């Protein structure tokens, strides 16, 4: 039993992971049923990387809210990886956590470590943060 989040943006995913016979369900749909399928491997990246034997005791239910679609995908994979590592640190021994963290971090650090980038504000005198209006001279 853990519930541990992952976020990229205002998209927020938290996986509910407790003991079982294997499961992945993102808001009641499983991982093979999410809408963007050019990004299908991003959610499956702990399943392809860790193998289905590393998930072999848990029932992971993911609940997401907020953000866009791609930021939601990038919060799903981070919340899944943090779910398995939090279960592994509490219930399995820590050398298995060490093995799973070097196999997860060295591939991609957004699987375990969040994104601190947020959208910077518009200021006046131009249509974005940095861009400015056209400024005729004559």
């Amino acid at each position: 039993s853990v519930q541990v989040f992952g976020r990229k943006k205002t998209a927020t995913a938290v996986a509910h992971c407790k003991r079982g016979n294997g499961l992945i369900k993102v808001n009641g749909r499983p991982l093979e049923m999410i809408e963007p399928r050019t990004l299908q491997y991003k959610l499956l990246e702990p399943v392809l990387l860790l193998g289905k034997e590393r998930f072999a005791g848990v029932d992971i239910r993911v609940r997401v809210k907020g953000g866009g679609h791609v930021a939601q995908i990038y919060a799903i994979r981070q919340s899944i990886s943090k779910a398995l590592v939090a279960y592994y640190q509490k219930y399995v021994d820590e050398a298995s956590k060490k093995e799973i963290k070097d196999i997860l971090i060295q591939y991609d650090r957004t699987l375990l470590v969040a994104d601190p980038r947020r959208c910077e504000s518009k200021k006046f005198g131009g249509p974005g943060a940095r861009a400015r209006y056209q400024k005729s001279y004559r």
Binding site: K8, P36, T38, L39, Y41, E45, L48, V70, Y74, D108
Partner: protein, 189 residues
């Protein structure tokens, strides 16, 4: 066994140059499943080189303003273009992208001097990371301009462009402009 798009082995393709060996990132650490990484890579000098070469390839196809910001459209385009490589040529496509970028970076170039508007140019040579990204820019030109007004769609045109720089036919705008902007550096000497 990290396979690109689920189907592409990265273990076997041959970088035949020394100068781009650390500047085309395709080998075993940079084997990723997808051309999307959502990375922080252009935040420092020389972290953008060891972005994967496929990720730079799909980002450089986002270029004009009708298609600004849209990444998964070019993930779809590069997916069908790689399948077009495997069907038309039937060799590993990662050798086709590696051969296009290694062959098409112009090895000599020209600089403007002459105090800002009298034209006398001077020839110097090109740094290898500039050769790599100049090659991706000359490969993404061509194909969009050669599928701007045609009945041909973009994916056949882009995969044929990477083919046409992989073998060096001189219909290739990457190879055509490579020879032109190196031969004017030959001429201003």
């Amino acid at each position: 066994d990290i396979k690109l798009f689920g189907k592409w082995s990265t273990d076997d393709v041959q970088i035949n140059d020394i100068s781009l060996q650390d500047y085309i990132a395709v080998k075993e650490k940079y084997a990723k499943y997808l051309p999307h990484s959502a990375g922080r890579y252009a935040a420092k000098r020389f972290r953008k080189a060891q972005c994967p070469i496929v990720e730079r390839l799909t980002n450089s196809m986002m270029m004009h303003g009708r298609n600004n910001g849209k990444k998964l459209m070019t993930v779809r385009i590069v997916k069908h273009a790689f399948e077009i490589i495997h069907l038309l040529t039937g060799e590993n496509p990662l050798q086709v992208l590696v051969n296009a970028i290694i062959n098409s970076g112009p090895r000599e170039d020209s600089t403007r001097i002459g105090r800002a508007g009298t034209v006398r140019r001077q020839a110097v040579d090109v740094s290898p990371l500039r050769r790599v990204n100049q090659a991706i820019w000359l490969l993404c030109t061509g194909a969009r301009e050669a599928a701007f007004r045609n009945i041909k769609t973009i994916a056949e045109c882009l995969a044929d462009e990477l083919i046409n720089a992989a073998k060096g036919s001189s219909n290739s705008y990457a190879i055509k402009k490579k020879d032109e902007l190196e031969r004017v550096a030959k001429s201003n000497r």
